[PDB]
Design an enzyme around this catalytic site. Structure first.
Site, PDB file in Angstrom:
ATOM      1  CG  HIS A  33      -3.076  -3.766  -4.919  1.00  0.00           C
ATOM      2  ND1 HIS A  33      -3.340  -4.281  -6.172  1.00  0.00           N
ATOM      3  CD2 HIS A  33      -2.441  -2.589  -5.124  1.00  0.00           C
ATOM      4  CE1 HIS A  33      -2.886  -3.452  -7.091  1.00  0.00           C
ATOM      5  NE2 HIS A  33      -2.337  -2.417  -6.483  1.00  0.00           N
ATOM      6  CG  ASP A  35       0.725  -0.489  -4.603  1.00  0.00           C
ATOM      7  OD1 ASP A  35       0.365  -0.820  -5.744  1.00  0.00           O
ATOM      8  OD2 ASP A  35      -0.048   0.045  -3.784  1.00  0.00           O
ATOM      9  CG  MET A  37       5.883   2.050  -5.606  1.00  0.00           C
ATOM     10  SD  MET A  37       5.245   3.269  -4.462  1.00  0.00           S
ATOM     11  CE  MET A  37       3.466   3.108  -4.730  1.00  0.00           C
ATOM     12  CG  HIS A  67       0.427  -1.616  -9.330  1.00  0.00           C
ATOM     13  ND1 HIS A  67      -0.293  -0.497  -8.963  1.00  0.00           N
ATOM     14  CD2 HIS A  67       0.961  -1.338 -10.543  1.00  0.00           C
ATOM     15  CE1 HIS A  67      -0.196   0.417  -9.913  1.00  0.00           C
ATOM     16  NE2 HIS A  67       0.559  -0.068 -10.882  1.00  0.00           N
ATOM     17  CG  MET A  69       3.251   1.483  -9.679  1.00  0.00           C
ATOM     18  SD  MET A  69       2.519   2.479  -8.359  1.00  0.00           S
ATOM     19  CE  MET A  69       2.113   1.210  -7.169  1.00  0.00           C
ATOM     20  CG  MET A 142      -2.541   4.095 -12.020  1.00  0.00           C
ATOM     21  SD  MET A 142      -2.458   3.206 -10.442  1.00  0.00           S
ATOM     22  CE  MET A 142      -2.236   4.534  -9.277  1.00  0.00           C
ATOM     23  N   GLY A 147       2.341   6.530  -6.918  1.00  0.00           N
ATOM     24  CA  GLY A 147       3.521   6.819  -6.127  1.00  0.00           C
ATOM     25  C   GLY A 147       3.220   6.912  -4.643  1.00  0.00           C
ATOM     26  CG  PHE A 148       3.534   9.341  -2.529  1.00  0.00           C
ATOM     27  CD1 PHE A 148       4.047   9.900  -3.698  1.00  0.00           C
ATOM     28  CD2 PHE A 148       4.400   9.080  -1.473  1.00  0.00           C
ATOM     29  CE1 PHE A 148       5.411  10.198  -3.806  1.00  0.00           C
ATOM     30  CE2 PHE A 148       5.760   9.372  -1.572  1.00  0.00           C
ATOM     31  CZ  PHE A 148       6.263   9.933  -2.742  1.00  0.00           C
ATOM     32  N   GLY A 149      -0.083   7.020  -1.393  1.00  0.00           N
ATOM     33  CA  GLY A 149      -1.461   6.803  -1.002  1.00  0.00           C
ATOM     34  C   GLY A 149      -1.964   8.088  -0.373  1.00  0.00           C
ATOM     35  N   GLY A 150      -3.233   8.116   0.020  1.00  0.00           N
ATOM     36  CA  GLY A 150      -3.784   9.307   0.646  1.00  0.00           C
ATOM     37  C   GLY A 150      -4.258  10.416  -0.283  1.00  0.00           C
ATOM     38  N   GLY A 177      -6.502   4.151  -6.189  1.00  0.00           N
ATOM     39  CA  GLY A 177      -6.192   5.534  -5.864  1.00  0.00           C
ATOM     40  C   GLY A 177      -7.383   6.306  -5.326  1.00  0.00           C
ATOM     41  N   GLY A 178      -7.429   6.466  -4.009  1.00  0.00           N
ATOM     42  CA  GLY A 178      -8.513   7.205  -3.386  1.00  0.00           C
ATOM     43  C   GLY A 178      -9.851   6.492  -3.290  1.00  0.00           C
ATOM     44  N   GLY A 198      -6.528   1.526   0.113  1.00  0.00           N
ATOM     45  CA  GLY A 198      -5.495   1.529   1.129  1.00  0.00           C
ATOM     46  C   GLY A 198      -5.951   2.209   2.401  1.00  0.00           C
TER      47      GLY A 198
HETATM   48 ZN   LIG Z   1      -1.360  -0.453  -6.928  1.00  0.00          ZN
END
Ligand SMILES: [Zn+2]
Length: 221
Positions: A33, A35, A37, A67, A69, A142, A147-150, A177-178, A198
């Site tokens: 995957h 990403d 941005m 992806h 974004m 989503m 925008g961010f991981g974690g 996401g998560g 991730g």
């Molecule tokens: Zn993604």
């Protein structure tokens, strides 16, 4: 439908992208995957076509899942012909069905899979007109603010997943996401078959264990 695990490279040591992807490939991950941005659609700038196109030189069978974004996703299609699926945001095209249908047609005419993504606050039902055309291979739900991981998995997004699986039995439903072992099981129970993870994979004590555990849990459903 197949159970697919797609590690998100955003969470890896991106200055060693090729090495990290080859590693995921060697562990059995079906997809990688990617990403993209642009500091406009989301407040972060990751990496673009030049990086992805170069990565392809060092991979083997792994599926390139991009992806987008970004604003103006149409501009990225001619720059990513060697990838496998291009996923753009419903919101990037101002949520209007006709524009999304046209982009999807173009992506499919490039012999690529086409995905469409919706952010947490976007109503899934707005996608029906587009999804009914059969031009969309995957819907990326989503499960976190992009925008961010974690960040933490939003359990309240599971309603969107159930809606899609019930209405479209052959549609690939991707969550992002998560995702970890527990939230993958939850997502799969609602209909998700493609898992983007991730942090839970790249920071795992035993990456292969996490990947296999996740896949089996999806396959059960
Ligand atoms: Zn993604």
């Amino acid at each position: 439908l197949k159970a697919i695990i797609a590690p998100s490279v955003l969470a890896s040591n991106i200055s060693k992208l090729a090495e990290e992807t080859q590693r995921m490939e060697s562990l059995g991950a079906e997809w990688i995957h990617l990403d993209v941005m642009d500091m406009h659609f989301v407040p972060n700038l990751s990496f673009g076509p030049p990086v992805i196109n170069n990565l392809k030189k060092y991979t083997k069978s792994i599926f390139f899942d991009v992806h987008l974004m970004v604003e103006y996703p149409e501009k990225y299609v001619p720059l990513l012909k060697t990838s496998n699926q291009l996923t753009f945001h419903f919101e990037a095209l101002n949520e209007d069905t006709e524009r999304c249908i046209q982009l999807a047609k173009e992506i499919r005419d490039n012999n690529l899979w086409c995905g469409i993504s919706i952010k947490p606050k976007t109503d899934v039902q707005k996608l029906v007109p587009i999804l009914d055309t059969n031009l969309i291979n995957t819907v990326l739900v989503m499960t976190v603010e992009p925008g961010f991981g974690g960040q933490s998995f939003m359990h309240d997004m599971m309603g969107k997943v159930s809606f899609l699986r019930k209405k479209y039995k052959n549609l690939n439903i991707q969550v992002d996401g998560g995702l970890n072992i527990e939230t993958t099981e939850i997502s799969a129970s609602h209909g998700a078959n493609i898992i983007v993870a991730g942090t839970s994979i790249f920071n795992a004590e035993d990456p292969k264990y996490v990947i296999d555990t996740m896949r089996v849990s999806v396959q059960k459903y």
